[PDB]
């Protein structure tokens, strides 16, 4: 009817939509959540998973849907990178929106943003670190998997045994009832075939090799670079044939169909070097330039900027390895590595760690630091392939998902940090931030005027409670004395209820923990999305 | 209109749907049931069978249908594995749902689950076993077939005569008025042709053989294993030709179209061994790895993991049998077996029985034990092919179904257990479980507090009555003294009414019996489905 | 709107539908019936025939139609086997339905069934037999044909002249005004051509033969038996050529297109035996295995189970007849039969009659006995072909139908039995059954308690009246003294009104008779259909 | 049924109080019959009707139940109402 919506009408719809989503999702929070039945054509999808709920919600009107997609996509993006924290995000989205509405005037919006930012900074400082030898890892594994004895014990011991190198765990569909483990080196890499022709059997098979001579290229290769490939390859085969171990690996960013067809002819050009059907030249692709530098260090390959640099080479630069490599369609795997090669890789790993030593406190939790930590795991770390078993085929597939969540949780736990659960960490952060600025006599004049005296602090303290209310409302804890009392006594020793067992105690005592990155991203993502929904006064539905 | 449904609305619809299904199905229970007319395009399907009713119910709204499919599929799955117990299942689904509604608070849901679980445990202990020499088998056969003199007598004698080996009964469409029996050994197997070409006549016919040399493979064979088949076959024909009885049988899990085409050429490669058109090499498929181990023991074949193991073989491993086998499109049949071969098969059968001897009480009724008992019947047991006759063609087809239900009932009867019918077994179980915990002085403090004092026990005792009410309401039994009195006098000697005859007495006296697995699965399936329907507060209808 | 119908709603619709059908059909009963106009696209079909009415009734709603098809098809099935009794059936369907409704409780339903069953038994005992020399046959022929002098006289004399052998009458479209008769032997058989190629002219013509050598096969012949046919045929032509009369007839159950193509080549293989274009080998099909045994006895052919038995034969088994046979597209006809062959056929006919002599009273009216009596008519009995004439072409076609009904009536009359018409036989049966049990002092205690004292007998006595009411309401008979008086005086000498003439008297005196099988089947079919309509409480309209 | 009906006075007085809050509903066992606990609504404390001092006159509760039975029977058995003024 009306494509242009402005005024009281837009903000009315925004609050309407937000309300309906908030009820649907927040109901699924915790082990004591209520289930949702989703239709997907003919079948029924009954689930309690928050991210599945948020993704699957549809509306009738276009206006309503437009608003929904602003809430959905930032929440969906949290589980793609971390793995946990969507419901929490959406909860707070309502929470902070409500706040922005009570305090109008664009000076107050500034005051709210600055206050919450400082709360984030306290959360990052509150972040607790944990080692592989500590029994806390078993507690987190038991909570994330919804109480399993065999699953939590196996992964915890696996990280405990490999004291030094962080083990990488990958999964597969098993046939046996019992689970089977393969403790191997298997240094995982991010390279794979450009074209199916280059593998053993000429149909994208898994080629195993016992010797190679790798060369890393930086540029994306297309039809323009077809001339330089013929120049570089024939130079290497003719001149430097003495110091060479077949096959020659041309690792790069991307290989186009024009370049791949040229390299297929170059394999056919020299048929003498073809041993048992294997092509002696293989181009390899990788989906952040320093990841290729890791690939160069692992395989003792020289780093090359241009394609024309392949001609100007020598015995000093060219080094053919005699290890063991396994090329694949999805990824490559390096198994056998000599003590001489490991000395080079460990020294390069220390160099990245020395950069992380010099970083600041706030920069340690950034994307720059997390990317550098990802490079360390690729270089140092043993690969463990677990074929997950079960009674039926459906149970095997279900158990793989339960295995995957435990691995993703434990890895991110020791990486970033751990905080006390049951919606306590948020309460401690807020009550701390208000108390910190008020206690400090230098800035107490302005700190009180902006936040405390205006009433924003009071409101923000009530909003931290929201997670704690929703989990434990209509339970043994909240039954006593009407509402809950958030006094100084509670701040020192915070009590919660373990919903799995039933007993009452501290989040530290009972063993209820959340990852640091999940709660931080939720609050960061919550602030930005809440501001946008609040400040938006106009909606356009007209298709151009 | 609204794809998202939440609140009082969802649970209202759930109860609405459940009510309509409960009325439709429970009306068909017992011999005194009322018929249902089903349309299926143009024809009318008049039936009293509960599973047919549940499958055929459709609704107009998508919301209503969504709920229906949660009730239907678990009930439909009971008749696929057992053969009886759907109405009973659906009955209790309403029953336990109603219970969950009266006692809110997720602590009470836990209390209900634990209580019912213990009732299941009493039902498993109450399970009575029966032998082939006992006249009770005639009573069960007479009840299941809805009173037939010739049918019940014939099957009961058939199990009674073969005292030791459990006879397998298979059916076929006959031409004569009288029924005809074929008492043969005919050791049934789970193997059949991979491709129609390999049979006699080259069009999937029934090939009879008098000598063979079998080889069992574990892996699923595809295009990748085509090389190893040519290596293994030509090794066997060239080297080990002296100790060989044609034809060679390659039994495996699955044969792809790529592998079958390769083996067709290998038959054509050696035309000297082809006798009267029969191909000398046949690949065989089977739809749980230990079933192939049974196939290996029957035919004296060596168990092989890999396809490459066919090369590395000797006279010690290779053993060509001189019995009699009948290959087929659906299944294979082994008839002639020497006393030397039967000694090997019986010794292997004892080994599986020795594993069942060491199992626990609860583990004996599990899927693990039932699968092992299925292997015993395949190894030891004579096959009896009965060509069922009648007056017309329609009566022959109808009588085959009546024959099939009797066989499925009698086999599962002596396998698992038998309980007293007329909805008595459930009442005895519940009243027993309440009395057991209350009498035991150690746990009486908490047992009373959770179940009895809260009023769940009282409610659960009224719910066991439901089967007994529905069968015998508006009869001679219920007419006296308004309602029925469930006192200690009734618990000792429970009276029922046989609906077929009319007389009054005990379920043991009159001969009304139910299989153990049916009533157990109904209550197990009832608890889980009832909890889900109760805890579900949300419905989604939006197609992604 | 609602696919699921349950409760008061189903039974309401059932009574509604039943009522509308009952009014439409029962109005057409008797010569004083009212006509119905049926549309069938563009033309008008004005008829008084009950079966045409029942078949042609359609409804608007699917629910209503669903109910209709339960009433229609059992009534339609009565005219397919007997030829008369549909209206009567449908009448009683309403009658017994009404009964079942007055007496609820599944014990009373049992009481009603047992009572009516005994009434059937009295009807079977009441059945009167008649001979060909008796003038009663003229009376029945006059009633069935709706008063015709020439038609009733001709058929009655035809059965009277052939005293011993029951004559078979077949019809054809004539050209002359006068009717023409062909008194010939023409022993009718149930065999015809498998393929049109095998006849004279090679296009399914009428082949006349004067000599043959028949062979009867039991099995259905297909592509599997193509090998044994070539073995059997060439054995007979080569070895046993001396004792053979052409052509060779291969009589069987069914001939597939694969087998027929093989036998066509075998005719071409031996062209020396082909006389004037006639193929010397003919396969013959027949649409109950003992009908082929009759075919074997007629033609002196050996009975053969398997196709391979054609090889193992001798001069003792093989016997080539020198009679006269006429093969055809619809049926074959055997005309000339020697005194030697008739001695064999008559002796076989006595053997079937000796089996009918030893049968019980209840077994004599069964399908088993009727099938055996059908075999006697095929063996012994002269065929009479009457070319029916008339003034116009439309009158010839109409007269053929009037001829056919007279033949079907007279044949079934002397076969089963005759009872007094005007709805008297049913009244005598019911009043007799009530009086029989009450008079017998041994069982009078329970007989009174179940039927008489409860009031079922009283009700059943009113229901027998229904046929008598509907025929003679608003006539000279019912005009006197308000209603009709069913006293002991009427039971001794029952009076009726002949609707054709107008005069008053006994059904025996006036000549109003019904066939036994029609009234029995109506009441048998009425009881079963009435019970189903009564006990059905549910309707399903949802297409799967 | 009659045992559930005696509870009615006890439910109406003490529903949504400290006594009924614990363990969902109230448990009328043999332990309670020996020493019956109530809540004094004036003060707030919990104890026996004898201990706290909550007493009813005999004639009041008797007349209530006597009067209750007769009036309840009449209301139940009455199937007809006439409103027409003569
Ligand atoms: N056993 C437990 N007892 C009490 N509280 C718990 C327990 N387990 C988890 N929690 C709390 O509930 C929260 C768990 O979050 P979820 O309900 O999984 O929502 P979410 O993590 O946003 O949803 P996702 O990302 O789709 S798995 C944590 O923040 C804990 O504080
Ligand atoms: N002759 C009988 N007299 C009294 N009770 C009977 C008789 N036969 C069976 N029963 C009872 O009725 C139940 C039979 O179940 P059914 O009516 O067949 O329902 P169901 O087994 O769930 O339906 P299915 O699985 O589709 S055959 C048993 O549990 C018996 O207790
Ligand atoms: N001339 C007659 N006078 C009196 N009653 C007759 C006469 N002819 C027949 N009847 C009676 O009416 C009945 C004849 O049945 P119809 O009206 O033909 O119904 P119907 O036989 O069920 O219908 P069909 O099978 O389609 S021919 C018999 O049962 C007789 O009792
Ligand atoms: K969750
Ligand atoms: K049933
Ligand atoms: K008629």
Numbering used by the authors:
A (entry chain B), B (entry chain A), C (entry chain G): 3 to 289, 295 to 551
D (entry chain L): 466 to 551
Paper excerpt:
To mimic the conformational changes upon ATP-binding in solution, we also determined the cryo-EM structure of ɸEL in the presence of the slowly hydrolyzing ATP analog, ATPγS. Applying D7 symmetry resulted in a refined cryo-EM density map at 5.8 Å resolution. The subunits assumed conformation I and were slightly tilted outward compared to ɸEL•ADP. Interestingly, we find a rotation at the ring-ring interface of 2.9° with a vertical displacement of 2.9 Å. This re-orientation would break the contacts between Asn465 and Glu466 with Asn465* and Arg469*/Gly462*, respectively. Moreover, the symmetrical van-der-Waals contact at the Lys486 residues can no longer form.
As anticipated, the ɸEL subunits displayed the typical three-domain architecture of chaperonins, composed of an equatorial domain (residues 2–130 and 425–552), an intermediate domain (residues 131–188 and 388–424), and an apical domain (residues 189–387). The domain structures of ɸEL differ from those of GroEL by numerous insertions and deletions, which alter the putative substrate-binding cleft and the contacts at the ring-ring interface. Our functional data rather suggests that the chaperone mechanism of ɸEL is encapsulation independent, and represents an evolutionary precursor of the more complex encapsulation mechanisms used by the group I and II chaperonins.
